[PDB]
Amino acid sequence: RSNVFAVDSQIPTLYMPQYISLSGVMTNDNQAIASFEIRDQYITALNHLVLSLELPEVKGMGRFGYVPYVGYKCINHVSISSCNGVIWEIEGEELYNNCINNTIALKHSGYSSELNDISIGLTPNDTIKEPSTVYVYIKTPFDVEDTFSSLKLSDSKITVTVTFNPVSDIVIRDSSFDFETFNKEFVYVPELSFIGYMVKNVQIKPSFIEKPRRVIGQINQPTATVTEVHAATSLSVYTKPYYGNTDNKFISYPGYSQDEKDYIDAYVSRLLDDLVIVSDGPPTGYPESAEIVEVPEDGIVSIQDADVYVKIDNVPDNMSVYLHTNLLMFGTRKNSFIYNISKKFSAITGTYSDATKRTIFAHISHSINIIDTSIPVSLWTSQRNVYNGDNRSAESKAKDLFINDPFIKGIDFKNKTDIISRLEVRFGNDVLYSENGPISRIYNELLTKSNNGTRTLTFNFTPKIFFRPTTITANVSRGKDKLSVRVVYSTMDVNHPIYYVQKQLVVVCNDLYKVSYDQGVSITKIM
Amino acid sequence: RSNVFAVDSQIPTLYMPQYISLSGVMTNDNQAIASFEIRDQYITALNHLVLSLELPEVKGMGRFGYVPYVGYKCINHVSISSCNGVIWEIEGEELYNNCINNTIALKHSGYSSELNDISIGLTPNDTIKEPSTVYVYIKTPFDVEDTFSSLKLSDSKITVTVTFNPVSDIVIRDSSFDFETFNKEFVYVPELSFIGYMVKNVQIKPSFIEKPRRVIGQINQPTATVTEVHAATSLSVYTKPYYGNTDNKFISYPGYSQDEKDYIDAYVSRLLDDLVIVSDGPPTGYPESAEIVEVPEDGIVSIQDADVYVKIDNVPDNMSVYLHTNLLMFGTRKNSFIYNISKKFSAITGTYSDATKRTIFAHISHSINIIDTSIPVSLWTSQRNVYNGDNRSAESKAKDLFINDPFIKGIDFKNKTDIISRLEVRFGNDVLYSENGPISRIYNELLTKSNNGTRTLTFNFTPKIFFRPTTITANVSRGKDKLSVRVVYSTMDVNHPIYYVQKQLVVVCNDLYKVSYDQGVSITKIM
Amino acid sequence: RSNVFAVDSQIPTLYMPQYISLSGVMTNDNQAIASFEIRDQYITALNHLVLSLELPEVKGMGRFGYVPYVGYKCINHVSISSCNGVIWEIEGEELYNNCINNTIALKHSGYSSELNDISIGLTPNDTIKEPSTVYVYIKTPFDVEDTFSSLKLSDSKITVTVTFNPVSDIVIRDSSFDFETFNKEFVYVPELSFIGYMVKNVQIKPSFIEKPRRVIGQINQPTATVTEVHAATSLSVYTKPYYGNTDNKFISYPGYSQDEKDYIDAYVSRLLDDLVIVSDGPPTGYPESAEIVEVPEDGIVSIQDADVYVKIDNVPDNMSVYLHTNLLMFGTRKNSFIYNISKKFSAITGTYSDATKRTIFAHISHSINIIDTSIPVSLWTSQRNVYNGDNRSAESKAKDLFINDPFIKGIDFKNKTDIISRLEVRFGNDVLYSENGPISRIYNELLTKSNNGTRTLTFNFTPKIFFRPTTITANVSRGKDKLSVRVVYSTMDVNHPIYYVQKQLVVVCNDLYKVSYDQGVSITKIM
């Protein structure tokens, strides 16, 4: 029988860990780049890199906030090199995707009301945000099995290089904020930390590493190809919106609250102030194409098959209640179907306030969804729209927000709508995998215990470090040395504005490398 | 010293995984049954079964929603067989209990506002629910240790058989919905997915598997027995309500929100409309046994020792505020104790609305609990009640809901009340285990890291796949070959309606089987 | 190739587990102590200790609730001994810190609305709390690797000793509650449970254990030292507030809701009733130093550079709205800076209610923070304050709460403010570690997957039970045998009341011991 009530304690290698901090050299659309040099003969190994960033004080007028997870979304590229060349590098989006299921890391990177609420400044000396510090955990393959997987610095110099996104990507602002001055005075202030191990009589062996590689397809094309694929551990596919043909303005943003319901509530709250008006006579200050009708005594207004029920309490006797019946409208033919945001409401109740002269709304019944919240403003007024799209007031138009978040997936802010209806993967000339529903995404989420998985083919099911990973292997004789992806996009109604949001296909392939430690550290691609 | 900074990477078996999808054959109270045949010489092993279901579009009038986790609660029985007979099978409740701690699987099975809100249809062409798809992860013993635990198809045919519950179990509806037509036109549309492994030169060994077995006791009896127990790894005990002697109608249901507080708020919101009435003269439309009194100037109404404080703002000068002092009442003797739902309120405030002619309530102080929310309507008006139990209005009575959820435990919707006061387990003739408090449930939750454990005796503490599980073993000579369970139910007040909810004892025993792969796959019960 | 599709199942030691329950002997500021004796020749090993406590029914008048996690916070000290002396012991705070990341254990210890809401009693026979039972999981080193790590009772007697905190520590109450009577009649009722293993032919080996050791520095001193440190696995540093120079009264407490936002909302709700008053003529019942001004027609009141916007709806025509412009004020010089709580509000809206004669507030804009919510009442009226600090009404002053929670860290209830600006650790005479930012806390949280980490130096990265832990080792020749900690506290404004909250430095060191089982169980400190 095997003893399950006692073990023989082995004696491990003699070592001592230490937390080490380093300052870097900054160089410069003059993209900012920081380089850090690690050179110490007593550091035998290292892992768990953490980057810290000091965000400065922001003063002035207007509305301003940071995007959620600002620390992660400010990073464009990270590279780790030695004298033999690059050892490992990655783009910001792949790092974010790898860390998306680590709630503590996400929270450390900057996720709080103080950073992400959209604050308001009233005078040029008002303080909008106080200074603070965020930390970015740079997850690497060297962390998966603690000491067993650490990177050995075989008496070489290690350089870490961080490339930063332009500050316009991490800021959410309205048009009143003095962004040009802010961008002129903003500077990145970084510092790198890691755990070092001073080891006595270390015994080094060769090991195994996976390096991600991203390919981005052409605009609106449904194909993409990764070349020179000889030993890959997985393949992922997803889509990104392209907002380069717009002005990047949006009606609302919820800030720190990030549920779907929160998005919808922020949107509805922004529309309600212009949708129902209590006025002495016909309300003024709206464009000529607005159709504002007076609410009858029974409270029901008809908008061609759609009925809206409006009841406001405490309305002054010299005033009436009006309903904006075409607040936002879009169509491609003069007498065809119309997408009308006013028709998405069925019941509106509330009470007029004499002291503040505005309506405080209570219960709302509606059918707004995340796609409606994700339509960009410039598409409402594009050239293909045969109507005047934006019939809002000037005060409402002055509250629109610029949003340039670089890691958005799908065509909405939550990646909730699935726009891929068929996926087909070819390895060489033959079909390797095809599916209609998102069964591969379901399997990805099940196997990784994540809520935000992607369509992923996994080829490796063996334990990570103690076994060589299982791969799909090339056959250059038959020409099996490339992976081509082809999708079929879902069909949308030609009269919905979201039909004209452009998209790009993204393919991610994880290639296998061999790590050898003779003549310091070097890698060679497994073929 | 053992090296903790390097390992020797072993080379694993050469294999390649693949996602596979299959359609099935449907046959038919004409219970629906689907059978799926897996036959491919290149599939060496498989695991991670996932069932997908397409739910159709629902139109018409009335109120309609799906129960939470509809995908899991639609399954009655799953069986896996070969030519040598059944290999593994399980009932829906055991599968649900095994997956209850997997939040991602639960969410994939169908848990969202679009499915579980109680939606309303106004015209016979109104769309209540849009079509959608859910996925059910069928957790099997072959998943616990990935490739190590997978099922080997030794050149045999594998059949998966799914038996479905009648659609009445998964639907929550009011009496206005045309359920007979819906049930006539509803059809299950299933598809099975799994991960297959094509293996090169596989080396097969015998392995170990546990098969659950359920026994249900007789109505209201406090005993149950599992026979032919020779090697069991665990034993569980819990209770189920039996609603077969009622009409299955309930006053309220919270829908997507599933906290205890949410249940209570939905219940209170449904009662408040009938409990406080603003009327011109004595309110009409209530049964003759209602005792509706006018609220005095100090706002305090006395109901025999109980005092209710009622203050409503903006009451018209030609109207008064009334309180229903016996909205629901139950008692067994004419002058004994009375359970009166009106006496569970202590303070009620709000404001009358002239525009909508209804009261919008603000702060409520009450002592309603989950048992009150879980009493079925038919028990309020049973023959043993000496009063007229339901003194609500017809409009309120028309909003009651049918609920037939098949996996309810305890006597309330959350299984919060513990109705077992003593548990005694006998193996043969001698006492094997007895307890007063729920210390075995506490231990179950601690060891499995679950929030919804049950009273469980665990006999196996060894690692799952690399060791033979530890069991309690029979001794047929002394007659130790049966487990008999006896409980003592808690004592309830004879004047509480919940005292008359019937219950059944459920015992679950996990038996050990041996898996051999000679002459294909076959199992033999370990004795 | 290594087989990854099959294993050889080893046969483990023959054993059988059993749940065992024991009653104890109670002895007695007459601190209560319970001792439990475990003596049974058939119990070979044990682990997973669980303590149960019955809390009694509480009746009377006033406001009363239990602190969150009452079961954990009622324990002062736990000790495990045999005839050779103490084997393992720990203080309540170290146990709490070790279990803080186990949500299920925390919830079992007593975390619910029924226990932690601040309930109200109206008559001397009112029931404030119903009886209930909580369970405290006493995490020990013997649990980390189930059977492998269990404690072997080599035919010796084991004694478990629990020392309880005085009941004043676990109760939150107002001054109306009859605490002297409650304390006279309260008694602890404990019971110990554990999992025992009856083992056949056990094979015992020596093993390894870590024992925590706490040192508390002197009041306001920024140093502390742990002597006789020869082999430590980690070191932790944090701070505690000392409320011994106050009366322990606080303005508000949120109860069951424990987010920062919840603390702030409870505080703001308590202030609003005294901050804005609707009255017929100048409001009465406030101290003479109150400066209550009438709100002008534009609704803007100026308080020296600060502007407050006040608009209340439905104000009677014979009444006006007043604002309390110095509700709480503190300063050290007569004409210097002033900390004024009235100036932390910028906008206040609401509606007066004629039926209940009070204001129901709606939207509030403010800058209150957790430090404001954590200032004790007695510091507002200390001798160093040159103003009268508390200008509240008597009704508001009668609602203050005593809070004596013994495990508070930092200077606020959430340990959110970081008051350590520099930390320096010396081992012998040389600097072992120094940092400015909380990078060691970040690393602690990353490595332990916790949201509530502390500043911690970790010396052991090897797997726990199968390897001897790695340590920092003494060198008594050079005098490396002590760890001295020195911090630099952050600088606060001399006109903020929180500057005068006293604090203590806490250092925790984990020493290594050897466990041998010859002559029963005994330990010897590793040197």
Numbering used by the authors:
A (entry chain B), B (entry chain A), C (entry chain C): 18 to 45, 49 to 547
The authors write:
In Vaccinia virus (VACV), copies of the double-jelly-roll protein D13 bind to the viral membrane via interaction with its partner protein A17 and assemble into a scaffold surrounding the viral membrane. This process leads to the formation of a spherical immature virion (IV). The 62-kDa D13 protein exists as trimers both in vivo and in vitro, and structures of the recombinantly expressed D13 trimer have been determined by X-ray crystallography. D13 adopts a double-jelly-roll structure composed of 8 antiparallel β-strands.
Furthermore, we expressed and purified mutant protein (D1318-548) with a truncation of 17 N-terminal amino acid residues, including the N-terminal tail α-helix. Our cryo-EM reconstruction of the mutant displayed no significant change from wild-type D13 (wtD13) or D13 with an intact N-terminal His6-tag. This mutant assembled into tubular and spherical structures that exhibit a honeycomb-like lattice under low-salt conditions in a fashion similar to the His6-tagged protein, thereby confirming the essential function of the N-terminal tail helix for D13 self-assembly. 130,384, 173,354 and 156,813 particle images were used to reconstruct the maps shown in a, b, and c, respectively. Their structures reveal that the wild-type trimer has an intact N-terminal tail helix (colored purple), whereas the corresponding density is missing in His6-tagged protein and in the truncation mutant. Reduction of salt concentration to 150 mM leads to aggregation in case of wtD13, to spherical assemblies for His6-tagged D13, or to a mixture of tubular and spherical assemblies for D1318-548.
